């Protein structure tokens, strides 16, 4: 019941299709608010669904009163899917990486650097 959302710098990008802003949080007793919570409070301010909003970079000040971050709120889910850097989509679980390491595709790369045409595909 005691948690407070204020929004400091605020701007609208017509060109990224988003409401892009700074998020302030008052949480005097508690440990830092989890993001899945803060999205809800934030959501009910701008009346939009939870889905479409992305908060990050939360930092808590010494002595435990306040927390500062960024958030950005997209018009359509889809716009988000295009415009958002992917890892953030992945914290929501929309986008999924490939689990191959760097040594992996590096090795495979130098392997098929050694053969001619159709044979390249036969290597892994």
């Amino acid at each position: 019941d005691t948690v407070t959302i204020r929004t400091r710098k605020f701007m609208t990008n017509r060109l990224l299709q988003r409401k892009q802003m700074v998020i302030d949080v008052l949480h005097p007793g508690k440990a830092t608010v989890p993001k899945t919570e803060i999205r809800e409070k934030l959501a009910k301010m701008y009346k939009t669904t939870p889905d479409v909003i992305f908060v990050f970079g939360f930092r808590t000040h010494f002595g435990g009163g306040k927390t500062t971050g960024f958030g950005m709120i997209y018009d359509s889910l889809d716009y988000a899917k295009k415009n958002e850097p992917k890892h953030r989509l992945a914290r929501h679980g929309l986008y999924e990486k490939k689990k191959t390491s760097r040594k992996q595709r590096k090795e495979r790369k130098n392997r098929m650097k050694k053969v001619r045409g159709t044979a390249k595909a036969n290597v892994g």
């Binding site: 005097p28 010494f62 002595g63 435990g64 009163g65």
Partner: protein, 180 residues
């Protein structure tokens, strides 16, 4: 190459003659009265003041009418005022050279807490600050040597998180209450 800042300074200088009765006694007194940790803390202050005295001395050779003397001087005096050392009567340039160590050892948070009578001994104070019971405005300060600005002095508190002003009891009262 890298993305890193290399800048740093030394915050103090160690005296030329290591052992002299005079220095040792005077600096011991300074240590005791304000409850400092080691001779370093004294040299630290002594050095920060020393810089100021150098700036001033190298303004004083310049003519009054010079833009730089006027501007740079007014800045220096202003900082020196708002920390609480100088007054606005004495706000001329030369009264700077009239400054002593004690004056900065005044405006340390450690001593301010003991002057405002929040803590009952100087050392009790140094503990109290480090123990996070102390706060400035809404801000909690963990450092004994935090120079307290003139205007920020009027609010120095017991920090609503703590037992003292903020009504939750500590570990110790908790245990004695769980036995009884």
């Amino acid at each position: 190459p890298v993305a890193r800042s290399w800048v740093c300074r030394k915050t103090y200088v160690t005296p030329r003659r290591p052992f002299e009765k005079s220095r040792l006694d005077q600096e011991l007194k300074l240590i005791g009265e304000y409850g400092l940790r080691n001779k370093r803390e004294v040299w630290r202050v002594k050095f920060t003041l020393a810089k100021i005295r150098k700036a001033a001395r190298e303004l004083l050779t310049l003519d009054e009418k010079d833009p730089r003397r006027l501007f740079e001087g007014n800045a220096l005096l202003r900082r020196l005022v708002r920390i609480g050392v100088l007054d606005e009567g004495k706000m001329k340039l030369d009264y700077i050279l009239g400054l002593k160590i004690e004056d900065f050892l005044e405006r340390r948070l450690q001593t301010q807490v003991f002057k405002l009578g929040l803590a009952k001994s100087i050392h009790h104070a140094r503990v109290l600050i480090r123990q996070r019971h102390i706060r400035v405005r809404k801000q909690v300060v963990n450092i004994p040597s935090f120079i307290v600005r003139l205007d920020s002095q009027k609010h120095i508190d017991f920090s609503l998180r703590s037992p003292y002003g903020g009504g939750r009891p500590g570990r110790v009262k908790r245990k004695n209450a769980k036995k009884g």
